[PDB]
Design a protein around this nucleic acid. Structure first.
Ligand SMILES: [Mg+2]
Ligand SMILES: [Mg+2]
Ligand SMILES: [Mg+2]
Ligand SMILES: [Mg+2]
Ligand SMILES: [Mg+2]
Ligand SMILES: [Mg+2]
Ligand SMILES: [Mg+2]
Ligand SMILES: [Mg+2]
Lengths: 105, 62, 271, 115, 71, 86
RNA sequence: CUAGAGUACGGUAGAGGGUGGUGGAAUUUCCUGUGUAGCGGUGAAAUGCGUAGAUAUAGGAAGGAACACCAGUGGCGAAGGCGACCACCUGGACUGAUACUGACACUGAGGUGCGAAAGCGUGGGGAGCAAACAGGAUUAGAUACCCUGGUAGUCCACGCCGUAAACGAUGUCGACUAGCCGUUGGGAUCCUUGAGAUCUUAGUGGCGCAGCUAACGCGAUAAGUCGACCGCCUGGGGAGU
């Protein structure tokens, strides 16, 4: 419970991420997990090359879902070429919105 | 990494920057594999020398 | 896997591979047909492949290798023993009848999978084209031509790894260690072949090989010069000639590949 | 053939110094080593040999121009900085000096210790 | 007293649960090459040094900070 | 063991007290944890460091059962037959 | 009866374990482009690798293990031991208030487990390192120290092995005995800005009085003062044979 999944997609696929966010969150809602934030940090340059690219599109997301949606998202990112990196996390607390993008601009 | 403005100033800034960043003593510590016993020897000896210095300086601070 | 007590001289080193997941007899009769035992003899009657003879009566299983049925989910009924293979076979049941035998993956005990196209890319046993799978996956039963059927990695415990994809070919590393390019539209099955414990086995006695169908093999040094190139001599001769096949082919370390048609499809030789 | 704004690579071991002049594509143009200057011994490891090799490499590089250089120093041995002072003496504008060094985070274990 | 004020730092404010997102704060504790600075230079408490190292490593995995000047 | 699972055992084997001190509660909690941990070590066979904790709980349970036998036999039997031990 | 011991409730810190996935520096192998005479190595040399285009340099592919900096007399674990990040289960220790069990405790001959490293059995894996082994040099001689190669092994799954300077050369548990200076993490009082101050626990370090010691030297983490239990020693070789 109370995950903070962060994943970044290919720069060429940044246009399609709007539908992908809903495509992933619909399964979480079907499982029964509410989503507390959905932030798109935008296009930024990487600190190093990941499969010979330098841009990406970070997508921040925090979820409170059972073990089934966790496994669903653990498998969906693996079998995708758009998603190049991911990091599932765990926090024993709630979620507040608008963390740092206001300061990052 | 050092950019450029006389050349001697750049040379000295490169030499000092490399020493401050490291990557010159570490290379010298990559030419022979010290066993973890020898590595714990460094940790014991440096700790003894650093803790002893903190007490020896107090004698000067009397 | 079990071990036999030395009750008799023949049981001292018998290592059996027992399983309780196999069904107790009664195979699906419609998918069985008779097979005669060749004995290593072609239509001329001459022995071509020697060291074959005897054995036990067996029925050939119509094992499905194409998996042409796409989209229809399938449910496993049971896993059965296949006399003419080292791996186990699983009996399927699609949404409307049409029971089939396939090479059982490591998935067992009434699993459900859909041999289809781009559907269900996760579970092992799913057959799909080689183009739409992630690199680095382990596959088995790889066909070399479209519609021919699975050819490579069908024995027990065998598999192959995906390593690259470019153009119409998808390179993969075989279990032998030989890199090979295969066409992208060729189907393959995710996972590993079931009976990985086959390598841990000891037949135990001389008679254990005779009901496998293999006839005893006789060395060349125990023959006369007329029979074998190694020939006879006085005492236990040291095989004074170089090691050689009965028909005069070098045995210890001589290449014998002369295809010269499919060499372009091989990236790296096994070494 | 004319190329400008090359990259100078310096590989300085404990027994030799190798100087190579390249471009942004990393294509070799002129290379010189301390052993080729004719030292072959304890004199080979001195930083003066790195200066002789560096200035010899800086003479064949003028065949293609290269009025601007980028220096990449590499290795712990002597002549790490002495070779750099032998570059601009030949009349090259050195834009930047960069430390490139293989530093394993854990890496393979190195050889055994001498006795 | 530059090392002394840095323990405050993290300790004076209610920022105990730091995050791997605040690059503006993380960059102050990373040297020019990219390696993370020690604790005796910044003077931060050992608890917050360990908490800050994990955040630096997470930001490194997310390619938000570099490892070395090589790339 | 979850908080609610502890609370359910406490409410079940409460000795008309409203408190969690008695051996009937302690042995019950230890037995519930021991039964739960059985499936963990069938998956993780080499987890020897966590194996040490289970033996500590088993020894504490056997000590508490001996103490309970040292005071009353009816209470000892009513717990052994109810938890399925010995 | 609650002072020992244990249970219930919050909250911390952790390279504490096991099952999977994913990272980037570096080494080696292979392919390709540029380029040309050495490279490598040593007290100094040689063996070796080189115009069959090496070393160096740039682009790409595969694979194995270790996890810079953080990093500390730092932390956890009964010990051995444990350093990349993430998910999964999972043990114990720590600090606070309240409620309860009401001696339920300590030790422990036999026995039952956990065992660094090496080693062995079956199956995989093969980057580096390196027993054995080959060559070169030094050497009266050199099986060695030095250099170039290099197999088992070092890695993974299951099983066996019971040994180490397995060290704090100090068995476990409980209580009293001047102080000073650090540090790990947890709470209290405190003017309130603190780079804050004092006390108190659970660890981890440096000095030090009384006491002990043959002396070195321990000295609230005693080798001081006392209690419970266990193990062990009786001159050196012979012989842990
Ligand atoms: Mg029939
Ligand atoms: Mg034969
Ligand atoms: Mg034979
Ligand atoms: Mg004969
Ligand atoms: Mg005869
Ligand atoms: Mg003949
Ligand atoms: Mg002993
Ligand atoms: Mg001893």
């Amino acid at each position: 419970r109370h995950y903070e999944i962060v994943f970044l997609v290919h720069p060429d696929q940044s246009e399609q991420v709007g539908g992908m966010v809903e495509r992933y969150t619909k399964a979480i809602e079907e499982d029964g997990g509410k989503i507390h934030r959905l932030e798109d940090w935008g296009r930024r340059q990487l600190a190093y090359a990941i499969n010979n690219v330098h841009k990406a599109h970070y997508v921040l997301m925090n979820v409170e879902c059972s073990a089934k949606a966790l496994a669903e998202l653990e498998d969906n990112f693996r079998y995708n070429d758009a998603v190049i990196r991911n990091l599932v996390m765990r926090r024993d607390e709630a979620v507040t919105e608008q963390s740092e993008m206001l300061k990052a601009e | 990494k050092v950019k450029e403005e006389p050349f001697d100033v750049a040379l000295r800034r490169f030499k000092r920057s490399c020493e401050k960043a490291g990557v010159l003593a570490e290379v010298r510590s990559r030419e022979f594999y010290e066993k973890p016993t020898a590595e714990r020897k460094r940790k014991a000896a440096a700790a003894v020398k650093r803790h002893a210095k903190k007490v020896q300086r107090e004698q000067r601070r009397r | 896997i079990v071990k036999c007590k030395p009750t008799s001289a023949g049981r001292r080193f018998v290592v059996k591979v027992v399983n309780q997941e196999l069904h107790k007899g009664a195979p699906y009769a419609p998918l069985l047909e008779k097979k005669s035992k060749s004995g290593g003899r072609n239509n001329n009657g001459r022995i071509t492949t020697r060291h074959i003879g005897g054995g036990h009566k067996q029925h050939y299983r119509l094992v499905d290798f194409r998996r042409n049925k796409d989209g229809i989910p399938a449910i496993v009924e049971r896993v059965e023993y296949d006399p003419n293979r080292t791996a186990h076979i699983a009996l399927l049941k699609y949404a409307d009848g049409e029971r089939r035998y396939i090479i059982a993956p490591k998935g067992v005990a009434a699993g459900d999978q859909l041999i289809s196209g781009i559907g269900a890319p996760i579970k092992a046993g799913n057959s799909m084209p080689l183009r739409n799978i992630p690199v680095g996956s382990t596959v088995h039963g790889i066909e070399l031509k479209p519609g021919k059927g699975a050819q490579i990695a069908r024995s027990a415990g065998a598999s192959a790894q995906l390593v690259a994809r470019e153009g119409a070919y998808v390179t993969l590393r075989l279990r032998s260690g030989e890199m090979r390019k295969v066409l992208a539209e060729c189907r393959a099955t995710l996972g590993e072949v079931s009976n990985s414990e086959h390598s841990l086995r000891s037949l135990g006695k001389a008679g254990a090989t005779r009901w496998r169908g293999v006839r005893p093999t006789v060395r060349g040094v125990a023959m006369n010069p007329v029979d074998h190139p190694h020939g006879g001599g006085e005492g236990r001769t040291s095989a004074g000639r170089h090691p050689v096949s009965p028909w005069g082919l070098q045995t210890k370390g001589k290449k014998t590949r002369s295809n010269k048609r499919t060499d372009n499809m091989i990236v790296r030789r096994r070494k | 053939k004319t190329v400008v704004d090359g990259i100078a690579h310096i590989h300085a071991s404990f027994n030799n110094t190798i100087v190579t002049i390249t471009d942004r594509q990393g294509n070799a143009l002129s290379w010189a080593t301390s052993g080729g200057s004719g030292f072959r011994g304890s004199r080979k490891s001195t930083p003066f040999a790195a200066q002789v090799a560096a200035e010899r490499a800086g003479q064949a590089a003028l065949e293609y121009g290269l009025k601007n250089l980028d220096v990449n120093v590499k290795g712990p041995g002597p002549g790490r900085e002495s070779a750099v002072r032998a570059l601009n003496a030949c009349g090259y504008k050195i834009a930047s000096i960069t430390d490139v060094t293989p530093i394993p985070h854990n890496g393979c274990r190195p050889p055994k210790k001498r006795r | 007293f530059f090392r002394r004020r840095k323990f405050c730092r993290f300790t004076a404010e209610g920022v105990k649960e730091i995050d791997y997102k605040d690059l503006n704060t993380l960059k102050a504790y990373v040297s020019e090459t990219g390696k993370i600075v020690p604790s005796r230079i910044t003077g931060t408490k050992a608890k917050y040094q360990r908490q800050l190292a994990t955040a630096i490593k997470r930001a490194r995995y997310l390619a938000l900070l570099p490892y070395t000047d090589s790339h | 063991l979850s908080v609610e699972e502890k609370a359910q055992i406490v409410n079940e084997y409460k000795q008309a007290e409203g408190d969690t001190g008695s051996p009937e509660v302690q042995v019950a909690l230890l037995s519930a944890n021991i039964n739960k941990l059985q499936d963990h070590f069938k998956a993780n066979g080499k987890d020897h460091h966590s194996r040490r904790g289970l033996i500590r709980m088993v020894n504490q349970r056997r000590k508490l059962l001996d103490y309970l036998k040292g005071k009353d036999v009816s209470r000892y039997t009513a717990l052994i037959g109810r938890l399925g031990l010995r």
